[PDB]
C-alpha cells in the first residue's frame, strides 16, 4: 500500500529544517544561556547580545548586527524552533522560549548522556510495578469509567513513555558502539603494535556490556509479557474493550522489537570481533 | 520631594528622548552633506 | 459671577497641566485615566469656558477629546504637510489590520515603512523627497529618516505612545480615528471633503 | 559586556550542521513511517531505496538518476549523524540502517501528534512523588557509602530529573497549543467581522480555565516535592563526603522553582492578550460591521494624491524669552 | 481646599480677560497705553500673581509700570528664545527712546533711521556672520540683512514694545516698555556710554 | 498597575533636556530649509 499521502501532506505544509553552522551555533548559545538564568525567560535584548557574540566569533560585519539578528529570529520563528510571547514590561518588549523541537535538538548536542545499566534497571523496576498495578486493577473489573481511568490511562500515558525511553537508551548504546568502532580505527591506524592491546581491551569491554544488557532485558521481559498476557486474557472476557485490546497488541509488538534488537546487535558484534581479529592476524602480526 | 509617575509615562518619556536624540544626530549629518554639496557645486562652477 | 462647578474644577490641582497641554493641540485618549476622568466629570462647564476663548471643544464618538479653533479664534491654528497625513492614514490602517492581533498593538517602524511603499506611487513620494531621486538607495534612506521625523512630530500631538528604551517601536492610540473623517460618510469623498472644510475640520491645500 | 564564545568556537571546529530541505525531510519521514510499520525493526538498504523511489516520484525528479542521487543523499545523512549503518554479514552493500536519537526526536515532533492532557501531568507527578518519598526515607535511615550511592544518588540522578524534564516538555506543548489558538483567532476574525465574536469569546475563556487548572495542580504538588528535597538536604548536611548529592539537590530545586514561576507569568500574559482582544472588538468591530471603512481607506490612500488636503489642530504661540 | 477667593472669580469673570490671558501667555509687555488693560491689571494684580504661580510663572510688574511674565526653569508652558540679532534690535530701540528729539518727533521714527543706526553702531563682520555664515560681504547680503531686520522689527511689534502708525508700516512709535532691554544699564551714568560699553563687550 | 518614584532634582533634568533638543531641532530645520533655498537658486542659475 502506497506512501505518497504522507509526502504530499508534508509538501503541502512546507515542513523543513535549515541550520548551517553559524545558525546552529547561535541556537546552542541561546540554549546554554537559557540554562543558567533563574527567571526562566529571556528577552530580545539578550538574544541580540548572543548574536553579537557569534558574529564576533565568525568575523562578520558589526554594522548590520541588529538587522541580521532580527532576520535570524524571524527565520527561527518561521521554522518553529522558538515561541514569541509579547511582554511590554520586558527589555525589548518580547519574551522568547524554546519549543519542543528546539529542546529535542539542543539537548542532544549539549546535554551529553552515556549508557548505564542502572538506568535501565530502574526503568524496568518502575514499569514493572506500574504494569502490575494496572493488571490488578483490570482483574478487579468495573464500569466503563473504571477501565477508562484505572486501566486505559496508565497503559496509554505511563507505560508507553517508559518503553520509548528504553528504546532511546538502546539507541544511545548503538551510538556508543559506533564511537567505539571509530575509536578503534583511530587507535590502530596510529601505532599498530602499541594499539593492539587497547583494541583487545575495547572489544572485551563492549562485548561484556552487550551481554549483560541482553540478559537483564530478557529477565525483565519475561515478567512484563506475563502481565501483558494477563491483561489481555482479562479483556477478552469483555467485547466492548477493543480500545484497550489494540493498545495491548501494540505494546506486545514494541516489546518484541526491543527484545530482538539486543540479540541482533550481539550477533553483529561477534561477527565484527571475528573480522577484527582476522585483520589483526593477517596484516598486523604478519608485518 | 519625591514624584511618583506611572510606569507607562516614564517609558514613553524615555522612548521619546531616544527617538529625538537619534533624529537630531541624523539631521546633523544631513545638514553636513547638504552644505558639502553646496560647496562642491560652487567649486566646480568656478 | 462663575458657576459653582466651573469654579470648583478650575481650582483642581490637575487643571494647569491639561490647560497647557490641550492648547498645544494634544489629543487626550482613554489611556490617561486621571485626566480623562477629570474631563468626563466636567465636560459641560469646561466646554462653556473655552467657548469664551472663541474656540470649540469636541468629543468625537470614539471617546477622545481635542480642541478645534474656529475662524475668529483667539488662539492660532496650524496644519501639517502631506507626508504627515500619509503616515497618519497608514497608522489608521494598521490599527484595523485583522492579521495584526498577533502583535497585541505593538509595532515597529520597519513595518510602517515597508507597508507605505506598497501603496504610494514610488516617484510621487520621491518627488516630495528629492526631485533627482529615481529609486536610489541614498534617497530611500533619506525618506527613511524623513518618516521618523514626521512620526516624532505626530507623537508630540499625541497619536502614538513611545515604548521602552528603544525608539524602533511604538503603540497606537484610538485618537488616530480622526484621519478617517474623509471616508466616514458613504457619499462621494469630494463633497464630504468640502463639508469637512465647511465644518472647519480641515483646510484645503 | 564581555563575551563567552568558547562553545561557538568548538562547534565551528567540529563542523556540526543540519541541512534538511523539504525533500530530505520528506525522505526521512518516509523512513520513519516504514520503520514504524514493520515488525522486525530493521531495514535493508533495498527498503530505503524503495522509499526514496516513492519520495522522488512524488517530487517529479528525473527517474534515470535515482540510484546515485539516493546513495549520495544517504551517505551525507550518515555524515550528519541521523542514520547509523550496520554491515549485516550476509549481504555487504546491503547494511541495516537505524535512526539515532536526534533523528527520532525530529521525526517524532512531526508524526507523533502530542496533545496536552492533564491526566498525564497528574500521573507523572504521583510517580515522582512516590519515588522522592522513597529517596527521602532512604536518606534519613542512613548507611555506608554504598548505601548512599545505590539508594539515594542513583534514584535522583536517573529517575527524578527525567520526570521533571517530561513535565517541562508538557508545558512546552501547552505553549504550542496557545500559539495555535492565537492563529485561529486571528484568521477567524479575518473571515467575517460580526459572526466570529461568539467563537472568540468561547475560545478565550476555555484556554484561560485550562491554564488555571494546570497551575493549581502544579503548585499543589510543588509544595510537597520541595518539602521532601529539604528533608534530603537536611539528612545529608551531617556527612562531609556527599557533596555530589548536594549539587543535584540544588539543581532540582532551581528547576522546580523555574517550572512554577513559569505558569503564573503565562497566565498574566494571557489576561493581557484577552484584554487586548476585547479592546479591538469594541473600537473597531461595531464601527464598520460591514468592512466598508477599511476598503474605502485603502482606496483613498491609493488615490490620495489626486486631491491633497490637510486637517487642523490648535497650536498656541510659544512664550518668547531672552537669554 | 479653598476652591475660590471671591475676588479671583470676580476677576476671571471680567469679559475682557480672555484676550489679555492669551496675549500675556505670548509674553506681550502689556503697558499703560491700553488704559483698560492697565486698569484691569491694577484692580486684580495680587490675585493674578497668585493664580499664575500654579504654572510656575511669576507675574512681575517692572518699576516703570508695565507688566510681563517671567517663567522659571520648570515652566509648565512652553518657552522659546529669540535670536541674538533680535536682541541687538531691542537694545537699539532702547537707545532711541531716550533721544531728546523724541519729544520733537512725538516718538515717530521710520525704519530707515533704525537700519542706519544698526549699521553704523554695529560691527560689520559680526553682522555679516549673522546674515549668512557663507556670506561674501557683498550687497545682496546687506539687502537680505535689511529684510531680516524688518522681520525682527515685526516680531518685536508682536511683542508689543512698538506701535505701527496709521496704515503705513513705514511709521511707528515707541512705548516705555523698551526698558526691558535697558534694565541691564540701570546705572546712573550716560545711557549712550553704557550701551556702547555693552555692545563693545558683546553683551 | 505600577508606579515609579523619583526625586525632583532628577526629574527636572529630563524635562529640560527634551525641551532643549526640540528647540535645537527646530532651529536646524529652519537652517536646512534656508540652505535648500540657496541650493535651488544655484541650480536654476546653472541651468
Numbering used by the authors:
A (entry chain D): 6 to 292
B (entry chain I): 4 to 49
C (entry chain E): 9 to 213
D (entry chain C): 5 to 327
E (entry chain F): 7 to 209
F (entry chain J): 3 to 49
Quote the passages of the study that discuss this structure, keeping the authors' original sentences.
MukBEF folds the chromosome of Escherichia coli and related bacteria. The SMC protein MukB dimerizes at its ‘‘hinge’’ domain, which connects via the long coiled-coil ‘‘arm’’ to the ABC-type ATPase ‘‘head’’ domain. The heads are bridged by the kleisin MukF, whereby the C-terminal winged-helix domain (cWHD) of MukF binds the ‘‘cap’’ surface of one MukB, and the N-terminal middle domain (MD) binds the coiled-coil ‘‘neck’’ of the other MukB. MukF also recruits the dimeric KITE protein MukE.
We discover that the gp5.9 protein of bacteriophage T7 blocks this capture site by DNA mimicry, thereby preventing DNA loading and inactivating MukBEF. Recombinant MukE, MukEF, and MukBEF were efficiently pulled down by gp5.9FLAG-bound beads, whereas binding of MukB and MukF was lower or nearly undetectable, respectively. This suggests that gp5.9 binds MukBEF mainly through the MukE subunit. In size exclusion chromatography (SEC), E. coli MukEF and gp5.9 formed a stable complex, whereas little if any binding was observed with P. thracensis MukEF. As observed previously in its RecBCD-bound form, gp5.9 formed a parallel coiled-coil dimer complemented by a β sheet of the N-terminal strands. gp5.9 bound along the DNA-binding cleft of MukE, overlapping along its full length with the DNA capture site. Contacts of gp5.9 with MukE differed from those with RecBCD, as did the precise path of DNA in the respective DNA-binding sites. Moreover, within the resolution limits of the structures, gp5.9 positioned several negatively charged residues (D11, D15, D21, E24, E36, D38, E43, and E45) near positively charged residues in MukE (R140, K150, R163, R164, and R179) or MukF (R322). Most of these ion pair interactions mimic DNA phosphate backbone contacts and thus prevent the natural DNA substrate from binding efficiently. The structure revealed that binding of gp5.9 to the MukE DNA-binding cleft is mutually exclusive with formation of the DNA capture state. In summary, these results suggest that gp5.9 inhibits DNA loading and support the notion that DNA capture is necessary for DNA entrapment. We show here that it inhibits E. coli MukBEF but not P. thracensis MukBEF and that its binding mode to MukBEF is different from its binding to RecBCD.
